[PDB]
C-alpha cells in the first residue's frame, strides 16, 4: 500500500518505516524535524532495503498535507507526529494542544479533502487515566488523563471517533501503549533523546554510559513484589510490527479499531535496572527517592485482543530491550549526526 | 475596561454588548458573521447608547486576533464565538472541533502573544455530562458530554484550565449555563435563527407565529410533575448581565473561576408552552412524541455560587422570557434585515 507516516523520522516512526519498506509498501515520511534529524533517513532506507520519500513539513499545515496526500496517492496514514513529553506538557500546554489536537485535526481535515479514509493513530495508554483495574482492557471506559499530554491524546481519540461516526466509511485504529524501548537489532537506529531523558530505560542507559551519575528510583514502598513501580515496556520493534499489521489488516475495514499493544505483563524498576546492568556488563548506579506524585504502584496493559484479532503478540524480551539499547548506544554514542 | 467580544453580533453577544456599552466600557466586536448579520450592529449601538467597534473576522485567524488585541489595547476578552448546534455537531464533528477547540486555542495563543490575560469563556452546562445528581453544582466533577458540541466545550474548559495553571497570572471564568431565552425589552433584538430552531422556545415562537404547525413534545411519561422534560431557561438579559459582572469583577483576579448561570429552578415543556400561549394571546399548538433519545427527565443548575460570589442572580421571569420573545417576533417578523 501507499502510506504516509507522519512523524516518520522519530523513534517509533523510524523503526516502523523500516518494517514498512521491508514489507514492500511505498513510504512517504512527513516530519518537521523538531525532534529528529535528517541523518536517520539514509539509515531507514538502508535498513529497509528500499527508498522512502521524505517531506519536511508540519501536520498543522493543512494545505501541504492535502498536497502530499494527492501527490502520492496515499491509501493510508500512520500518525506518529506530535509532542510527547509529559512534564513539558504541564509547562507548555498550548504547544501540546496545538501540535496534538489541532495537528491531528488539520491532518484529518486534509485527508477528508483528499479522499483518504484509512488512519492508524499512535495513541497512548494514559487515556485509561486513573483506572485501579489492571491490567487495562480496551473494553474499559477511558478516564481523565493527568497531564495536557495525556488529555490531548484522549481528545484526539474522541475527535477521530466522532469523525468516523459521521463518515462511516473510514477505518481508524487507536493503538494504545505504554513504554517503547529498545532499538533496531542492527544497533544503527534507536532512541536519541536530546536533554534529560524522561523515560526510565534511556535514563538508565545514559547513567550506564557515564553521562549520568545515578538513577533515582521514585519509591521503594509500593505494594509490589520488590517495592518499586511496575510498568509496561514494549520493544520498539514489536510495537513497529504492531503498527504495520494493524495498517495492513485494518485498511478498508470500516470502524474505530482499538487495540492495546504490549507484552501483557509489567516489570518493576529494579527488574529494568538489573536487565540493563546485565546488558552493559556492569552494575547500573541508582538510589532511592520518594514516590513521584501521581504514580500508581503498578500498571500494565492486557494485549489479548490484538493477539486474537490481529494475531499479533510481542516476540522480544526485556533482556533484548536492554541489549539492543546498549548496542545502539555503543555503536552511536553520539546518536545521529548533525 | 477595553473588551474584545468575540461572537459579539450573535444572540448572546449582541445583548452582552449592549449592556457593556451601557456600563461605559469600550467594546470591540469580532464576528465572522457565519451566524449573524451586520444589521444588528447599529441596533447594538443605539440600544447601548455608544459605539462599538466591529471587525469582521475569524477566531481561527491567530494573526488577526493578535493584531486586534494590540490595536485596541484589549484588557479582557469575552468569548462567545463558536458553533453551538448539537445535532449538526453530530453530523459535522470536524467543523465543531475546529471552530470551538482550535478556534479558542488560536484565540488564547494570540492573547498570549499580545500579553492579554483576562478571559471570560461562554461555556455550557453539557460539561456536567450525564450527572444524575441535580441540580448541578460547580463542585461536581464534569462528565462525558454526548455530542461533539458538548465535548468541544469541555475540551476548551480543560485547555483553558491547563493554561492558567501554566500561566498563573491569568484570570479565566468558565460560565456554564443552559437555555438562553428572551430578547431585549425593546423588542428590537432577539434570537434570529435561520432554519429549524433547535431550542424549544424559538421553536414555540415560530409555531405560534404561524411558521410551524405544531410542537412535538418528546415524552409525556417522565418522572416529572406533568410528565414532560424539565429544563433550565435563563433570560438572555440576565445571562448577558452575568457575563458583564463576571468580567468586571474577575478582571485581574488570578484563577479559573467557574460559575453556573441560571434561575436555579427547572420548568417543564408544558410550563414553557403555557407561558408562551399566555404571551402571544393564543393557545400554542402541540402534540406528543416519544422520548427523544439521550434525554434526562429533569435537569437544572444550582446558581448559589454566582449569587454569593458575584452577588448575581436572575431578575427576569419565565413569563418575561416569553413576552419579550413574542415582542421581538412581533416587531421584527423577518428578523434582521439583509
Ligand atoms: N515515546 C513514548 O514514550 C510514547 C508513549 C505513548 C505514545 N507515543 C506517541 O507515539 C508518537 C511517536 O512518538 P515517538 O516516541 O516516536 O517520539 P518522537 O519525537 O521521536 O517522534 C515524533 C516525531 O514527530 C515530529 N513532529 C513533532 N511535532 C510535529 C508536527 N507538528 N508536525 C510534524 N512533525 C512533527 C518530530 O520531529 C519527531 O520526529 C507520538 O504520537 C507519541 O505521542 C510515544
Ligand atoms: N444558544 C445556546 O443555546 C447556547 C447554550 C450554551 C452555550 N452557548 C454558547 O454561547 C456562545 C454564543 O452562542 P449564541 O447563542 O449567541 O449563538 P450565535 O451563533 O448567535 O452567536 C455566535 C456568533 O459567533 C460567530 N462565529 C461562529 N464561529 C465563529 C468563528 N470561528 N469566528 C468568528 N465568529 C464566529 C457567529 O457569526 C455568531 O454571530 C457560543 O459559545 C455557544 O456555544 C449558547
Ligand atoms: O528517573 C526515573 C524514571 C522513571 N522511574 C520509574 O520508572 C517507571 C517507569 O517510568 P516512566 O518512564 O515515567 O513510565 P510511565 O509512568 O509508565 O509513563 C509512560 O506511560 C504513560 C501512560 O500512563 C504516559 O503518560 C507517558 O508519556 C510515558 O512515558 C515508573 O514506576 C517511574 O516511577 C524512576 O524511578 N526514575
Ligand atoms: O421541539 C422540541 C424541542 C425541545 N423539546 C424539549 O424541550 C426541553 C428543552 O429542550 P432543548 O431546547 O433541547 O433543551 P436542552 O435539552 O436543555 O439543551 C440545551 O442545553 C444542553 C446542556 O445539557 C446543550 O447540549 C444544548 O446546546 C442546549 O440547546 C427538553 O425536555 C426537550 O425534550 C421538545 O419537546 N420539543
Ligand atoms: Na451522519
Ligand atoms: Na547527538
Ligand atoms: Na509552570
Ligand atoms: Na430574516
Curated annotation (Swiss-Prot), chains A, B:
Pfam family, any one: Epimerase
Binding, NAD(+): 11-12, 31-36, 58-59, 80-84, 99, 124, 149, 153, 178
Residue ranges crossing the lipid bilayer per the database entry: none
Reaction equation(s) it catalyzes: UDP-alpha-D-glucose = UDP-alpha-D-galactose
Variant or mutagenesis effect after changing residue 153 to M: Decreases the catalytic activity. Not reduced by sugars in the presence or absence of UMP. It contains very little NADH
Keywords associated with the record: Carbohydrate metabolism, Galactose metabolism, Isomerase, NAD
A GO CC annotation given for this chain: cytosol
Pathway: Carbohydrate metabolism; galactose metabolism
GO molecular function: identical protein binding; NAD+ binding; racemase and epimerase activity, acting on carbohydrates and derivatives; UDP-glucose 4-epimerase activity
Positions with a binding annotation for substrate: 124, 149, 179, 199-200, 216-218, 231, 292-295, 299
Cofactor(s) essential for the protein: NAD(+)
Regulation of its activity: Inhibited by UDP-phenol and NaBH3CN.
Single biological process term from Gene Ontology: galactose metabolic process
Inducers of expression: By D-galactose and D-fucose.
InterPro entries: Epimerase_deHydtase, NAD(P)-bd_dom_sf, UDP_G4E
Catalytic site: 149
EC annotation from Swiss-Prot or TrEMBL: 5.1.3.2
Binding partners and assembly: Homodimer.
Function as written in the Swiss-Prot or TrEMBL entry: Involved in the metabolism of galactose. Catalyzes the conversion of UDP-galactose (UDP-Gal) to UDP-glucose (UDP-Glc) through a mechanism involving the transient reduction of NAD. It is only active on UDP-galactose and UDP-glucose.
Similarity-based family: Belongs to the NAD(P)-dependent epimerase/dehydratase family.
Protein name: UDP-glucose 4-epimerase
UniProt organism field: Escherichia coli (strain K12)
Classification of source organism: Bacteria, Pseudomonadati, Pseudomonadota, Gammaproteobacteria, Enterobacterales
Amino acid at each position: 500500500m501507499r502510506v504516509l507516516v507522519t512523524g516518520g523520522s522519530g523513534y517509533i516512526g523510524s523503526h516502523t518505516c523500516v518494517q514498512l519498506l521491508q514489507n514492500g509498501h511505498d513510504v512517504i515520511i512527513l516530519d518537521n524535524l523538531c525532534n529528529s534529524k535528517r541523518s536517520v533517513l539514509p539509515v531507514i532506507e538502508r535498513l529497509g532495503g528500499k527508498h522512502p520519500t521524505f517531506v519536511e513539513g508540519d501536520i498543522r499545515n493543512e494545505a501541504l498535507m492535502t498536497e502530499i496526500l494527492h501527490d502520492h496517492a496515499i491509501d493510508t496514514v500512520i500518525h506518529f507526529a506530535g509532542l510527547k513529553a509529559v512534564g513539558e506538557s504541564v509547562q507548555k500546554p498550548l504547544e501540546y494542544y496545538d501540535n496534538n489536537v489541532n495537528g491531528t485535526l488539520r491532518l484529518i481535515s486534509a485527508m477528508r479533502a483528499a479522499n483518504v479514509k484509512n488512519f492508524i493513530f499512535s495513541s497512548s495508554a494514559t487515556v485509561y487515566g486513573d483506572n485501579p483495574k489492571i491490567p487495562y482492557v480496551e473494553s474499559f471506559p477511558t478516564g481523565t488523563p493527568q497531564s495536557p499530554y495525556g488529555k490531548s491524546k484522549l481528545m484526539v481519540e474522541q475527535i477521530l471517533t466522532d469523525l468516523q461516526k459521521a463518515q462511516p466509511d473510514w477505518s481508524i485504529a487507536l493503538l494504545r501503549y505504554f513504554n517503547p524501548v529498545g532499538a533496531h537489532p542492527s544497533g544503527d537506529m534507536g532512541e536519541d533523546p536530546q536533554g534529560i531523558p524522561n523515560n526510565l530505560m534511556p535514563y538508565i542507559a545514559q547513567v550506564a554510559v557515564g553521562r549520568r551519575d545515578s538513577l533515582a528510583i521514585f519509591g521503594n514502598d509500593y505494594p509490589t513484589e520488590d517495592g518499586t513501580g511496575v510498568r509496561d515496556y514494549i520493544h520498539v520493534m514489536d510495537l513497529a510490527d504492531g503498527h504495520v499489521v494493524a495498517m495492513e489488516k485494518l485498511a478498508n475495514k470500516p470502524g474505530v479499531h482499538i487495540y492495546n499493544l504490549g507484552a501483557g505483563v509489567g516489570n518493576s524498576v529494579l527488574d529494568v535496572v538489573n536487565a540493563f546492568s546485565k546488558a552493559c556488563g556492569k552494575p547500573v548506579n541508582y538510589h532511592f527517592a520518594p514516590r513521584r506524585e501521581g504514580d500508581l504502584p503498578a500498571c500494565w496493559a492486557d494485549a489479548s485482543k490484538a493477539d486474537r484479532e490481529l494475531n499479533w503478540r510481542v516476540t522480544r524480551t526485556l533482556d533484548e530491550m536492554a541489549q539492543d539499547t546498549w548496542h545502539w548506544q555503543s555503536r552511536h554514542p553520539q546518536g545521529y549526526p548533525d
